[PDB]
Design a binder for this molecule. Structure first.
Ligand SMILES: Cc1c(C)c2ccc(OCC3CCN(Cc4ccccc4)CC3)cc2oc1=O
Ligand SMILES: Cc1c(C)c2ccc(OCC3CCN(Cc4ccccc4)CC3)cc2oc1=O
Ligand SMILES: COCCOCCOCCOCCOCCOCCOCCO
Ligand SMILES: *[C@@H]1O[C@H](CO)[C@@H](O)[C@H](O)[C@H]1NC(C)=O
Ligand SMILES: *[C@@H]1O[C@H](CO)[C@@H](O)[C@H](O)[C@H]1NC(C)=O
Ligand SMILES: *[C@@H]1O[C@H](CO)[C@@H](O)[C@H](O)[C@H]1NC(C)=O
Lengths: 535, 537
């Protein structure tokens, strides 16, 4: 019995497992329950803290993945499968994982808490790209990740009802944050230094913890990779959430009154709800998700935009960034003329039709404004430009410009902000070249996977992964991603509204740039809302 | 006769003329100045279409410039060369329908391609007798026959009560047409080729040229056309019948008048200077680059809006040279946009930029005005006074000239015409406006006419050589419909503008350089998006 592998937390005793990372062992505690299984009558309800257990609970394997839609676009293709559940699905899924150096840290160690993405309808903390061993073994970090309910089980909401108040998936994350405060110090973690980080919907989640007071006493710094609480997809209004839930109920026979309706839904097998999750969207679209956080006036006292516009963020530090090609991944999911298999060279008509699917809320005049802005009028009909502009419309509307707005409002209201753009395309990537650096393919580098020799990355990429892990961990330690040992003269400067400085992350050394899509995001952030408004 | 110069006596349809032998730097040229081509449009003829001049008896002396058409005189900067050079340099009078002819001396042997100049001045000012429209350099150095005509401006030229008989509108354009007919019948008596007539003009003169392209009766009077910094399409060159009737009725009221007949009859009793003194009071909004009395869309001269005509016209037999100067808008800011002056750097604030945009784009709704400010803002330096100043100029210049011209080039090109486009980027070493204005509106003219060749005008040697190149381009285009020199192949070639390639050339002290895209991004905003945004808002 290994003593480094035995931990006592407030609920009982855990047994971890020793894992070999490239440079040495690490202690892993996988599958720790942090809440009562949200099953039967607990479906759609806020989580409850886990009850104590007897004996030694075995924490040496990943637990189940929260029940969720499983993608089928390209069956068997690594590029999509790598995001699919790699364990059994189950509503009984509220578990978390802790990686730690081996032996356990001698000093209290800053903690990183990963919140996975997946559009609030999918995702799991057990995916290979979220493997926490490299960060713990190389940087000596204590790394935590939790499962949280997705889709109908995490965010179906009859606002104001007692039986489905919405946002329970975010309340799952919050309970895991509360768990870290109460237990992490038993693993050697420092609960007074907790950094959240996440990507896509995980990044947005991080942002809502920034914007929700009860969460603010549970972390000290945040990282939002390719996602924001503001923007067009991360939240919905009480009304639109009430609409979609009532429609999903109709589609499954409920009701044959809020309590009446939610009771019948708790009767249905999980897959019956998943079967119809995608049929409640008001328009044909990409980058829109049926069940996402709701503006309930509770977890979110107002819209994310209103909250970032007025909040005080003085004692907060944030690292925010985007990938080079945010939108490419999504075109193959609904925009006619796109495929991972051909080069997706589109006509102009295809480009206009595609803009209605990328900006599904846009009016006639507003889609025209978008088309005229992204058209290259020296080659207005070149298909290569047209496809590339299609990807930029989607990525700019859903990620880049939302990020630039958040970064600007945070910096202006006291926060200390650092911004990046990630421009390296993995040598291992299996999507076609035309997709560039797609949404989500910086993650494998920040977690250090290239340091695994069997994965067949390039020597340059291994050196690159280490640099990224230093930025992230250095940010967790200090709030500043710059190395207190490297006194070479390319320093990552803070993003400000004045200079708007950000850095390029790629194989070459840090390069400092100014203006994050400044002109084009002026269009999205400043003009387009006044347009759609006056219509 | 008997003891006068036999090379200076000519007969035209209306009688005999005596011209004058002028000195150009390279030799003598024949000038026939102040030839009347119409009955004086005075008295009961004010606002009426012109009539042919009645033949005279004896030898009409044609050695001096005749009257300038009655017009507003500029006073923003009294005695300053930048404004005085454009002011009237002969007596103001309603009796002003005269034209001028320059030819080589002795007059040419073979029939010679003809150039007709139509001055600008916003349709409220101008004269064919200004120093910068001097034909003696084109005539002497290129051997061209050059003709320029006065036309009625302001109320006398363009006040209209559309549909009435006593003020049908556009008589100023009919004045120009009557001169074009005069050239058809008489230019052979000077050695000019009536079958090779090229029009060229600038600002409102360029737009005039564009209007003759679009009016069917004019089209049988010329063969080629050059439009410098001006277009018949665009926000300022025309007004609807409704606007024109409203402005004419308002000016009448402002001068004591009072049924169209009685109302026009009253205007005809007013002193010319009373009309001029109230011209500017009829503009619907605080504006720059708007002019009270301009050509009206009458359904006669202009069968429809210029936009509709250039959109649906056959131009496969047309050859046009069109271009702009580097800083079309800067000149106009100091005539209305608070914060701007010729005597300081005009560094303005973001608030002055927003107020200035409402003035340069006087028709924009609040949303359309916001779109303009969002487009032209430098979001990395959104409060930089220098960028805001240069963006104010870009707004006015792009809205009024560069994108109207860009739209015109693309339409004519798509519909059969042969088009050549340029941007004129050289600032005269003699310019008296401040540096920040760059290359202002209308400051390529003195180079096209070849003033730099006048040794007393203190230009540089390169400026002299440059003006020769420009004269070579214009005349070659007149001779052949192609500005390129047939023999000289070493020089870089000036390609036609096309929709596929959108090629144009820069004209400056350096050799011809070819560029693609006539401010393509920004003009898509002006020409494609803004019209639909104002259609809603
Ligand atoms: C990622 C994603 C998926 C999977 C999707 C599925 C169906 C649909 O209709 C739209 C969609 O949009 C998306 O962006
Ligand atoms: C050139 C020009 C003049 C002289 C002008 C006069 C009065 C006015 O009101 C606006 C004006 O705008 C102009 O663009
Ligand atoms: C040049 O930067 C424009 C900055 O836009 C500010 C937002 O307002 C504009 C709103 O109008 C709609 C735009 O119409 C389409 C034509 O525009 C092309 C602009 O393409 C610039 C790309 O870099
Ligand atoms: C790419 O493939 C898809 C499906 O195979 C097809 O629908 C699409 O039209 C193709 N792309 C082009 C540009 O033809
Ligand atoms: C320039 O002068 C004008 C008039 O004198 C004034 O209104 C303007 O504010 C001045 N601008 C600067 C930058 O000095
Ligand atoms: C040219 O320069 C001379 C001397 O510098 C001056 O006397 C003359 O007036 C100038 N003429 C012009 C047109 O600038």
């Amino acid at each position: 019995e290994d003593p480094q592998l035995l931990v006592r937390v407030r609920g009982g005793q855990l047994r971890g497992i020793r894992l070999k990372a490239p440079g040495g062992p690490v202690s892993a505690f996988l599958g720790i329950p942090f809440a009562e299984p949200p099953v039967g009558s607990r479906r759609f309800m806020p989580p409850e803290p886990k009850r104590p257990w007897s004996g030694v609970l075995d924490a040496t394997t990943f637990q189940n993945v929260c029940y969720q839609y499983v993608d089928t676009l390209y069956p068997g293709f690594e590029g999509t499968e790598m995001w699919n559940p790699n364990r059994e699905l189950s509503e009984d899924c509220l578990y978390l994982n802790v990686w730690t150096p081996y032996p356990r840290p001698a000093s209290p160690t800053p903690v990183l808490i990963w919140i996975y993405g997946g559009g609030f309808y999918s995702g799991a903390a057990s995916l290979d790209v979220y493997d926490g061993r490299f960060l713990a073994q190389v940087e000596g970090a204590v790394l935590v990740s939790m499962n949280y309910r997705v889709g109908t089980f995490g965010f179906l909401a009859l606002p104001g009802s007692r039986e489905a108040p919405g946002n329970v998936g975010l309340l799952d994350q919050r309970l895991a944050l509360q768990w870290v405060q109460e237990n992490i110090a038993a693993f050697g973690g420092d609960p007074m230094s907790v950094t959240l980080f996440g990507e896509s919907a995980g990044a947005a989640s991080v942002g809502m913890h920034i914007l929700s007071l009860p969460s603010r006493s549970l972390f000290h710094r945040a990282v939002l990779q390719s996602g924001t609480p503001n923007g067009p997809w991360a939240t919905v209004s009480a009304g639109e959430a009430r609409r979609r839930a009532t429609l999903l109920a109709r589609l499954v026979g409920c009701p044959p009154n809020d309590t009446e309706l939610i009771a019948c839904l708790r009767t249905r097998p999980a897959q019956d709800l998943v079967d119809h999750e995608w049929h409640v969207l008001p328009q044909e679209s990409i980058f829109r998700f049926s069940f996402v956080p709701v503006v309930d006036g509770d977890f979110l006292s107002d819209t994310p935009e209103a909250l970032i516009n007025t909040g005080d963020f003085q004692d907060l530090q944030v690292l925010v960034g985007v990938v080079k090609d945010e939108g490419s991944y999504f075109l193959v999911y609904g925009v006619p003329g796109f495929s991972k298999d051909n080069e997706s060279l589109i006509s102009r008509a295809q480009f206009l039709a595609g803009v209605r699917i990328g900006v599904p809320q846009a009016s006639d005049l507003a889609a025209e404004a978008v088309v005229l802005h992204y058209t290259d009028w020296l080659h207005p009909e070149d298909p290569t430009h047209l496809r590339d502009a299609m990807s930029a419309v989607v990525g700019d509307h859903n990620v880049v410009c939302p990020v630039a707005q958040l970064a600007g409002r945070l910096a202006a209201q006291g926060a200390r902000v650092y911004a990046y753009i990630f421009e390296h395309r993995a040598s291992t990537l299996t999507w076609p070249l035309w997709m560039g650096v797609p949404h989500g393919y910086e993650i494998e580098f920040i977690f250090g996977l290239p340091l695994d020799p069997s994965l067949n990355y390039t020597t340059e990429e291994r050196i690159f992964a280490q640099r990224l892990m230093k930025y992230w961990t250095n940010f967790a330690r200090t709030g500043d991603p710059n190395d207190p040992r490297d006194s070479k003269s390319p320093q990552w400067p803070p993003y400000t509204t004045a200079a708007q400085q950000y850095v390029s992350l790629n194989l070459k050394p840090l390069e400092v740039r100014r203006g994050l899509r400044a002109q084009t995001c002026a269009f999205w952030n400043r003009f387009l809302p006044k347009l759609l408004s006056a219509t």
